[PDB]
Design an enzyme around this catalytic site. Structure first.
Site, PDB file in Angstrom:
ATOM      1  N   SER A   1       0.801  -1.215   0.000  1.00 25.02           N
ATOM      2  CA  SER A   1       0.000   0.000   0.000  1.00 25.02           C
ATOM      3  C   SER A   1       0.840   1.274   0.000  1.00 25.02           C
ATOM      4  CB  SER A   1      -0.958   0.014   1.206  1.00 25.02           C
ATOM      5  OG  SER A   1      -1.906  -1.035   1.123  1.00 25.02           O
TER       6      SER A   1
ATOM      7  N   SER B   1       2.251  -7.203   1.442  1.00 26.20           N
ATOM      8  CA  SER B   1       1.124  -6.561   2.093  1.00 26.20           C
ATOM      9  C   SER B   1      -0.134  -6.665   1.220  1.00 26.20           C
ATOM     10  CB  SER B   1       1.530  -5.107   2.380  1.00 26.20           C
ATOM     11  OG  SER B   1       0.685  -4.508   3.333  1.00 26.20           O
ATOM     12  N   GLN B   2      -0.742  -5.538   0.842  1.00 32.36           N
ATOM     13  CA  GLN B   2      -1.929  -5.606  -0.027  1.00 32.36           C
ATOM     14  C   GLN B   2      -1.583  -6.380  -1.304  1.00 32.36           C
ATOM     15  OE1 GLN B   2      -5.185  -2.892  -2.538  1.00 32.36           O
ATOM     16  NE2 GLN B   2      -3.980  -1.895  -0.910  1.00 32.36           N
TER      17      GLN B   2
ATOM     18  N   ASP C   1       4.127  -8.826  13.351  1.00 29.12           N
ATOM     19  CA  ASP C   1       3.465  -8.184  12.208  1.00 29.12           C
ATOM     20  C   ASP C   1       1.991  -8.573  12.334  1.00 29.12           C
ATOM     21  OD1 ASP C   1       2.446  -7.138   9.857  1.00 29.12           O
ATOM     22  OD2 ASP C   1       3.876  -8.127   8.530  1.00 29.12           O
TER      23      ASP C   1
ATOM     24  N   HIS D   1       6.009  -4.963  10.186  1.00 35.23           N
ATOM     25  CA  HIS D   1       5.438  -5.034   8.840  1.00 35.23           C
ATOM     26  C   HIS D   1       6.339  -4.347   7.817  1.00 35.23           C
ATOM     27  CE1 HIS D   1       2.308  -5.793   5.982  1.00 35.23           C
ATOM     28  NE2 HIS D   1       2.085  -4.522   5.732  1.00 35.23           N
TER      29      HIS D   1
END
EC number: 3.1.1.74
Length: 197
Positions: free
Chosen positions: A26, A104-105, A159, A172
């Protein structure tokens, strides 16, 4: 650097042997973000500049932070974009071995895309790496419809996104060392397992 469109730009008459499709996290820049370039450099070292095409997921994938809250952990438009890239790879270079990854995303995006992919194309993805996998708990550390032996998940202790939350804590943002070493190591090993050397 942070933008690589080797697949889109590449000549169909001179296809690379390996095509890597990667989705950023992101708010990250270009189509590779913070971790993609490190993975790319190592793949180029192993297969040579002409041996591997590096392709980030750009286009409709805006990497909007809010989309992490959507059902699949990303938007439908983003999934359509990545599916399109796998489809372009399959058409442009039918004999190339594919590999993928996401952070992540981008990890949720890679998982959703691979899940929806036509089995014949999905089966060409020799390995997939996921960093800070937002659907790690929900999917039990797997990508639906994709073998565990071809999957590698990097989820740091602390995380929170790997443990069912959407809170962003310091762990993260600590996947740098993994992107520089074990992640490309895994991808290279999985490609060689099927292509030989």
């Amino acid at each position: 650097r942070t933008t690589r469109d080797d697949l889109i730009n590449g000549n169909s008459a001179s296809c690379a042997d390996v095509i890597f499709i990667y989705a950023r996290g992101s708010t990250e820049t270009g189509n590779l973000g913070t971790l993609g370039p490190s993975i790319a450099s190592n793949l180029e070292s192993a297969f040579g500049k002409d041996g591997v095409w590096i392709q980030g997921v750009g286009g409709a994938y805006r990497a909007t932070l809010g989309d992490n809250a959507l059902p699949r952990g990303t938007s439908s438009a983003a999934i359509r974009e990545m599916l399109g890239l796998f489809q372009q790879a399959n058409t442009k270079c039918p004999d190339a071995t594919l590999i993928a990854g996401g952070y992540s995303q981008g990890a949720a995006l890679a998982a959703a895309s691979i899940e929806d992919l036509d089995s014949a194309i999905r089966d060409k993805i020799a390995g997939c790496v996921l960093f800070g996998y937002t659907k790690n708990l929900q999917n039990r550390g797997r990508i639906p419809n994709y073998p565990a032996d071809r999957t590698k998940v990097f989820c740091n202790t602390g995380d929170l996104v790997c443990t069912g939350s959407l809170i962003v804590a310091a762990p993260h943002l600590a996947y740098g060392p993994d992107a520089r070493g074990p992640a490309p190591e895994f991808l290279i090993e999985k490609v060689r397992a099927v292509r030989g050397s």
